[PDB]
Design a protein around this ligand. Structure first.
Ligand SMILES: CCCCCCCN(CCc1ccc(OC(C)(C)C(=O)O)cc1)c1nc2ccccc2o1
Lengths: 270, 270
């Protein structure tokens, strides 16, 4: 019954709204403008970064970075901080997915551990455009050029994410669409170490059925969007792989720096 | 009109048969036996191998390999020759894909350059089962274990292809399905360096439409098979990468071993 599917899509869309502060609809409003109601502080260079805490609230540093916590290392940890935060928000969302809590406990933990990086980059696209990404609830905007101009190692971290986002965003999906896609990502029966794949693939198929009808009704003129969206999951696993090895190099040259137990434990070159 | 899509499915299925001498239908008939006509000889060790160049035709060496062109390398040269052979067959098939020969000569070259190996591993699955792989037109069968017992580097070239084949074969696709799927693989507009992405994507969208109707008609009871097959496109990408780096190692350990020009050209670590 398409009613059961249209019911699942609304449920998911609702949990999605209650779990993620900044939505794509909202974020797009901020990136395009046409209003004064909400204009974020812009970081486009070293100096503008310092004022970061001047106008926004960051537990990072403002003054000299070289001698007291380098600039790149400080922006990196800010990314890490927001990430462990997003992980908790994704974990709560997963709980609203029909059937998720009923799965073996170890399976739930395995699905979140391997699916978190893929969902973060997916959702990150919602906050990106060709020239930059929104930060701290959308109160900020960090330039694509400023990021691409960081120290030897930290210089090529976000550029690949920007390359993916520009393409992903070309599909013009909205929150109701993304709410189901993220659910599909989480219920992946191919993660390493799963104990009972069946019930997981059973739920994903129900989510795939809901995603297809959603795209059919929401994008009548976008032929084969479903197929195209699934093809993007390939670029996500690639980005995540490339991210692991780039994260390793950081773990070899930046000894003074650390990696929170979050983006460490759920990390075994997954 | 689903009638136009069925015509495309027929066309492609027809060219596939004409382009690939060893179809999956023939391969499964040789593998599952119950035959007397097509029983393959089996290579499971250095001895059966020596006898293999007797019954089956093998332009290689029979006696000693060590100081006389090692056996591991002798087998490696065997795959190399078979791959160049497959590239030529895949190239012929491609030209039958409507619209393909009408694209910029550069894009044609690029689509073939990055799609060939993804196709080779897909079709290679047709000749595999958990225990081994058919060789030399089906006259032979080389064991998974023998292959995994070769020299340090060459010993792990095939294992991931096998691990892929066991999962991919569980979908139970037949030649008519594979004909469309391989067409879809080749016409991937997300290949590095393509000059004209749009004419390529219009072709792929039409092929995906064809694949979707084909799977629904051919596998009425296989829920979401279309989406399951597309996700398989990610396991192929990994296979290639893994292969490339392993190939880089050989390039250094054996400065006396040569690579066929056609394979060296498609390869640029991509
Ligand atoms: C219709 C039958 C077609 C042939 C079936 C068997 C194919 N096969 C290994 C498959 C293979 C294909 C490509 C590969 O990637 C290479 C390494 C080529 C690359 O792209 O670098 C790697 C492995 C094989 N191995 C043999 C050794 C000895 C004798 C015969 C053999 O046959």
């Amino acid at each position: 019954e398409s009613a059961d599917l249209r019911a699942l899509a609304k449920h998911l869309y609702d949990s999605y709204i209650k779990s993620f502060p900044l939505t794509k609809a909202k974020a797009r409003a901020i990136l395009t403008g046409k209003t004064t109601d909400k204009s974020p502080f812009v970081i486009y260079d070293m100096n503008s970064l310092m004022m970061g805490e001047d106008k926004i609230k960051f537990k990072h540093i403002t003054p000299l970075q070289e001698q007291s916590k380098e600039v790149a290392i400080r922006i990196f940890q800010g990314c890490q901080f927001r990430s462990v935060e997003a992980v908790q928000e994704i974990t709560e969302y997963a709980k609203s997915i029909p059937g998720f809590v009923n799965l073996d406990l170890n399976d739930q933990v395995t699905l979140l551990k391997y699916g978190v990086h893929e969902i973060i980059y997916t959702m990150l696209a919602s906050l990106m455009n060709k020239d930059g990404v929104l930060i701290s609830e959308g109160q900020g905007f960090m330039t694509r050029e400023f990021l691409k101009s960081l120290r030897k190692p930290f210089g090529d971290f976000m550029e690949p994410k920007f390359e993916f986002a520009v393409k992903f965003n070309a599909l013009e999906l909205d929150d109701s669409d993304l709410a189901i896609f993220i659910a599909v990502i989480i219920l992946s029966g191919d993660r390493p170490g799963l104990l009972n794949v069946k019930p997981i693939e059973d739920i994903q198929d129900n989510l795939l059925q809901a995603l297809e009808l959603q795209l059919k009704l929401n994008h009548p003129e976008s032929s084969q969007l479903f197929a195209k969206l699934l093809q993007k999951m390939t670029d996500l696993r690639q980005i995540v792989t490339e991210h692991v090895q780039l994260l390793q190099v950081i773990k070899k040259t930046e000894t003074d720096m650390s990696l929170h137990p979050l983006l460490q434990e759920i990390y075994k070159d997954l």
